[PDB]
Amino acid sequence: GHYQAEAALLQCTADTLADAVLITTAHAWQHQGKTLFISRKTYRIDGSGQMAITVDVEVASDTPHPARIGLNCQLAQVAERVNWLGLGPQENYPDRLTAACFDRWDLPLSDMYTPYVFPSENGLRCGTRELNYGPHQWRGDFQFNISRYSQQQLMETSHRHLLHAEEGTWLNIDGFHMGIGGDDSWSPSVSAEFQLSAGRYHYQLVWCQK
């Protein structure tokens, strides 16, 4: 039920600090009465206008290891360039990133999408410390992809030519992403060290305006 799981809200609180506002949340993703994942977050918005997001995720040991642990949203903005400090310039994944180099990369948005004839998750860049897109900057230690296509559309579309650019820009920012495998393509081939099996995961991001 990973694709069908619904987020039940466990906690949502707001506190005013000396120089900041703190929002704390907790969600449980459940399927047929089974809790798959728990996500606990804090959002700290300070006087500098920066939003620090801390995320702690619990994954049930008896659920299949998830494809990713991250956040996503559809941004209103469509910008021409994507600028990042991390592994690149090309698409790279945890078990396919040796060729990628750590540097400051700057590509047109279209280059952040890989046009596989059969559409799927694509265009991830790993080991990224800073991402810039229009007025937005995200900082941390994350993997990301960014494109005009939602994960839902990619999942529901059989051929690349049938894809349509959606309104705005879909951003996926992952603390953690599963390996892609490939020893063969007809049996599970992601090696143990690239499966998300740790049970508890932590990541942190800062969102601000540049």
From 70, 88, 119, 140, residue interacting with Na ion (rule: CB under 5 A): 119
Annotate each residue in 33-52 with x if it binds a copy of itself (CB under 8 A) or - if it does not, as one string. Answer: --x--x--------------
Phi/psi zone of residue 45: left (φ > 0), alpha (ψ -120 to 50 degrees), beta? Answer: beta
Q: How far apart are the C-alpha atoms of 78 and 74, rounded to whole Å?
A: 10
Least Å from the CB of residue 53 to a copy of itself: 14
Q: Of the ranges 37-45, 73-81, 87-95, 117-125, which one interacts with Na ion (CB under 5 A)? A: 117-125
Q: End-to-end CA distance of the chain: give it in Å, rounded.
A: 39
35 versus 157: smaller Cβ distance to Na ion: 157
Least Å from the CB of residue 195 to a copy of itself: 15
Q: Name the binder of 10 from a copy of itself, Na ion, none, CB < 5-8 A by kind.
A: a copy of itself
20 versus 78: smaller Cβ distance to a copy of itself: 20
HSE at residue 178, side-chain half, CA atoms within 13 A, is 19
In the chain, the DSSP E strands lie at 6-16, 20-31, 34-46, 51-59, 68-75, 81-88, 101-108, 125-133, 136-147, 169-177, 200-209
Determine contact, residues 35/148, Cβ cutoff 8 Å: no
In sequence order, the β-bridge partners of residue 8 are 28
Q: Is 186 annotated among the ligand-binding residues?
A: yes
DSSP calls for 78-132: --SEEEEEEEESS--BTTB-SS-EEEEEEEEGGGGS---SS--S---EEEEEEEE
From 28, 85, 101, 180, residue interacting with a copy of itself (rule: CB under 8 A): 28
Say whether residue 10 binds a copy of itself (CB under 8 A).
yes
Say whether residue 67 binds Na ion (CB under 5 A).
no
Q: How far apart are the C-alpha atoms of 44 and 177, rounded to whole Å?
A: 25
Annotate each residue in 50-69 with x if it binds a copy of itself (CB under 8 A) or - if it does not, as one string. Answer: ------x-x-xxx-------
Which two structure tokens, joined as six digits, stand for 71?
A: 């956040």
From 1, 7, 12, 13, residue interacting with a copy of itself (rule: CB under 8 A): 13
Number of residues that bind Na ion (CB under 5 A): 1
Say whether residue 7 binds a copy of itself (CB under 8 A).
no
Binding site for a copy of itself (CB under 8 A): 8, 10-11, 13, 15, 17-18, 22, 28, 35, 38, 56, 58, 60-62, 141, 200, 202, 204
